[PDB]
């Protein structure tokens, strides 16, 4: 269930509401201000890291579950999504349908969205690929 959630369900949740569109209108207080702006943020593919921890000083290192148990940490990994920004504009005149066009400013660029706690011995966890000798080396019970 956890591997299904990580591998497929996260991307589906992202793709359900990937688009976020903010519309600025003409603001026709003057005839020189006849431009309407369409501001769109789209979420792309989502990336997950290996389990990990940042410390107080900002140093970030791989977190193994034994240390997480010892240091009262949370055995979690980061989530990164691809965010592209679409900005559109249209000359707003009354009596005509608005036709927005890309201003060719599409900046894109993974952004960190949060830390997903990782179930142990899942496909993202370190212990899934570990052998018995590796588990002994990591002080984990086979």
């Amino acid at each position: 269930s956890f591997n299904q959630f990580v591998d497929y369900t996260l991307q589906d949740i992202i793709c359900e509401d990937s688009t976020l569109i903010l519309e600025q209108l003409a603001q026709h207080t003057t005839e020189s201000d006849n431009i309407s702006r369409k501001y769109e943020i789209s979420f792309g593919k989502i990336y997950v890291t290996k389990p990990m921890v940042n410390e107080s000083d900002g140093v970030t290192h791989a977190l193994y579950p034994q240390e997480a148990r010892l240091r009262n940490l949370t055995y979690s990994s980061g989530l990164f999504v691809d965010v592209k920004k679409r900005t559109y504009e249209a000359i707003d005149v009354p009596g005509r349908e608005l036709k927005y066009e890309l201003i060719a400013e599409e900046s894109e660029g993974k952004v960190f969205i949060g830390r997903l706690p990782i179930m142990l011995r899942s496909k993202n966890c370190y212990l899934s690929e570990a052998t018995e000798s590796d588990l002994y080396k990591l002080k984990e019970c086979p």
Partner: peptide, 9 residues
Amino acid sequence: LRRKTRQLK
């Protein structure tokens, strides 16, 4: 009198 920004579903 205009509402300025708005949500676009």
